[PDB]
Design a protein around this motif. Structure first.
Motif: not given
Ligand SMILES: Cc1c(NC(=O)c2ccc(N3CCCCC3)cc2)cccc1[C@@H]1C=NC(=O)C(Nc2ccc(C(=O)N3CCOCC3)c(N)c2)=N1
Length: 265
Positions: A35, A87, A150, A153, A135, A83-85, A19, A23, A15, A133, A37, A128
């Protein structure tokens, strides 16, 4: 406290990276979408998180992205979440800009406000909150993600208020000046999130640097009313930006305000 057995997790798709590193999308026991991490070594205060993770799992609400459990008996540790489809909300707004009705935008604000009212009632700070942040699931429901993480980190560019990753554009004056976090600093961030929603994912204070943003909001500069926000809606988001924290509403009051606009519309 729910120590998930890593043998029960099947990885299915990359995915991207956040930070804390990589994932993945996968399933728990062949059925439940999750999902995962994979916490990059050095990115997180791990002993601190493990000592405190049960409080975060106990936060249960339909508009929070659930933290189901952890895997900590190996390295890297895993954090397993709902999981959140569709994004993250920021990209969802930008990719579908020409498909939203204003009623749907207000419903996104209601979704987030319900989650934050629940966190407020548990005296739990997000710290944050921003469209990046939140979904979005396969039915368009918006949920709040990574509340409370947050604090763990390890990255000076994110933890310093003058670092290039610090969420300056979502921070009230007392966070930028004193690192004073409270429910009222989440309130300020929620107002900026409402502005992100009604602007269909524009960057707040675009063309200003982080330090210019800090300088000018401390002197009273505020984000303008997005075209799609009625004056009633703008009044709600603007109320989040009182200079003085104790003049800002609660999430309980914001939710009542949002429901009133729905009933009027
Ligand atoms: C969360 C996250 C991060 N980021 C962190 O992990 C993180 C953030 C902030 C942080 N900070 C420090 C902590 C406090 C806050 C700030 C720390 C870590 C990076 C990658 C993925 C995800 C997630 C998590 N769960 C999901 O369900 C999900 N789902 C989907 C679904 C579809 C897609 C997709 O491809 N598309 C969408 C649909 O149409 C087609 C294209 C996608 N890209 C993701 N993605």
């Amino acid at each position: 406290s729910w120590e998930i057995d890593p043998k029960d997790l099947t990885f299915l798709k990359e995915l991207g990276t956040g930070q804390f590193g990589v994932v993945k999308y996968g399933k728990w026991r062949g059925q439940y979408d999750v999902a995962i991490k994979m916490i990059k070594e050095g990115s997180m205060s791990e002993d601190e998180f493990i000592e405190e993770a049960k409080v975060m799992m106990n936060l249960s609400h339909e508009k929070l992205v659930q933290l189901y459990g952890v895997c900590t008996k190996q390295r890297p540790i895993f954090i397993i979440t709902e999981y959140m489809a569709n994004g993250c909300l920021l990209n969802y707004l930008r990719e579908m800009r020409h498909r939203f009705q204003t009623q749907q935008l207000l419903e996104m604000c209601k979704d987030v406000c319900e989650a934050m009212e629940y966190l407020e009632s548990k005296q739990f700070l997000h710290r944050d909150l921003a469209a990046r942040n939140c979904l979005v699931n396969d039915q368009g429901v918006v949920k709040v993600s990574d509340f409370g993480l947050s604090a763990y980190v390890l990255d000076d560019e994110y933890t310093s208020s003058v670092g290039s990753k610090f969420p300056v554009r979502w921070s009230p004056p007392e966070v930028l000046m004193y690192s004073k976090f409270s429910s009222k600093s989440d309130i300020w961030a929620f107002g900026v999130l409402m502005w992100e929603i009604y602007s269909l994912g524009k960057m707040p204070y675009e063309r200003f640097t982080n330090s210019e943003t800090a300088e000018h909001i401390a002197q009273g500069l505020r984000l303008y009313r997005p075209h799609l926000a009625s004056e009633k809606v703008y009044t709600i988001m603007y109320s989040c930006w009182h200079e003085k924290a104790d003049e800002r509403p609660t999430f309980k009051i914001l939710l009542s305000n949002i429901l009133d606009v729905m009933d009027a519309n």
